[PDB]
């Protein structure tokens, strides 16, 4: 089996600045890591969001270290990648990019990574990032056109392949959406829905069921009750513990009954982190398809939203929720 090293958390929120690519008048001042950033001055909103992201990652696995860069610039990325390789070589490096406060990406990885003060700085090419971090790695792209990034990444991998003939293809990617579509601007959802699905699958699953179902079969149960559910995420005797057990069992069952055994073991048995991410990924797929969004992964999987086992989950949820009042 393999292990991992520290997580590279790279955020680009630019709280208080609306990118020129969007026009927003709909009151969708949505949460980021369950924080409403406009209730605090920019410095505390940014630091607080950082801290919550850190905790969300710690909740899934104890870490050797995380490091976080809430600010630009490019030199900081170079130094971080170098340090990460120094504590490598075989263990996987995890990257997380948001870009919510940044203009939409393009073929060259355009991103607002600068020491200014309103400068349209840099085409921060994927190729250079591949050079800086050549070790096995996992990338998460929670952005408006993440599939475009995955496509460009593979094209640069082909370029490198051609150059070598005169740790590529050992890394995996999870993309928020296909290159040709945008993330939804829907009131009452978090602004970082993909991240929340990958890191907090129960809060999202329950809030989603409460707002999504056409007809509720449990009168009296609403968001005010779900957000007060007692228990712990590591105690099988509590409501939340039971829900996490059931969720894990169903997700693993679906993976077992859909994927080839080779992919099954490579994704769900050879590493704790990858297995956790893919188990939550299937949920993200099921939820996001209702918004006209299609998550994209580097290896392609058969569709799973059609599988009968999801109905069992819905029933179990209603049963548990019926005991809350």
């Amino acid at each position: 089996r393999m292990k991992t090293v520290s997580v590279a958390l790279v955020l680009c929120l630019n709280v208080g600045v609306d990118p020129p690519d969007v026009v927003k008048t709909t009151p969708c001042a949505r949460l980021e890591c369950w924080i409403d950033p406009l209730s605090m001055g920019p410095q505390k909103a940014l630091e607080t969001i950082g801290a919550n992201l850190q905790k969300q990652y710690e909740n899934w696995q104890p870490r050797a270290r995380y490091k976080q860069s809430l600010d630009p610039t490019v030199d900081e990325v170079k130094k971080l990648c170098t340090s990460l390789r120094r504590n490598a070589k075989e263990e996987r490096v995890l990257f997380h990019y948001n870009g919510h406060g940044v203009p939409r990406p393009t073929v060259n990885g355009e991103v607002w990574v600068f020491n200014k003060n309103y400068t349209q700085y840099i085409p921060l090419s994927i190729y250079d990032l591949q050079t800086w971090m050549g070790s096995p790695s996992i990338f998460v792209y929670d952005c408006s056109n993440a599939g475009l990034i995955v496509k460009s990444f593979k094209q640069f991998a082909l370029q490198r392949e051609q150059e070598l003939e005169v740790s590529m293809k050992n890394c995996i990617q999870l993309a928020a959406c296909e290159a040709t579509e945008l993330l939804p601007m829907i009131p009452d959802l978090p602004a970082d829905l993909f991240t929340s699905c990958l890191t907090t699958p129960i809060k999202i699953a329950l809030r989603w069921f409460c707002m999504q179902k056409c007809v509720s079969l449990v009168p009296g149960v609403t968001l005010d009750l779900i957000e007060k559910i007692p228990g712990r995420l590591n105690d099988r005797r509590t409501p939340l513990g039971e829900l996490n057990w059931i969720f894990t069992a169903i997700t693993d069952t679906i993976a077992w009954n859909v994927l080839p055994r080779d992919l099954f073991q490579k994704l769900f048995r050879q590493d704790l982190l990858v297995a956790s991410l893919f188990r939550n990924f299937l949920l993200a797929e099921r939820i996001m398809r209702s918004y006209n969004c299609t998550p994209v992964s580097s290896p392609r999987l058969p569709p799973t939203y059609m599988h009968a086992m999801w109905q069992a989950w819905d029933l179990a949820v209603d049963i548990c929720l019926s005991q809350l009042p």
Partner: peptide, 8 residues
Amino acid sequence: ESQFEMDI
């Protein structure tokens, strides 16, 4: 160091 640990 398993992919899944529990105590039942």
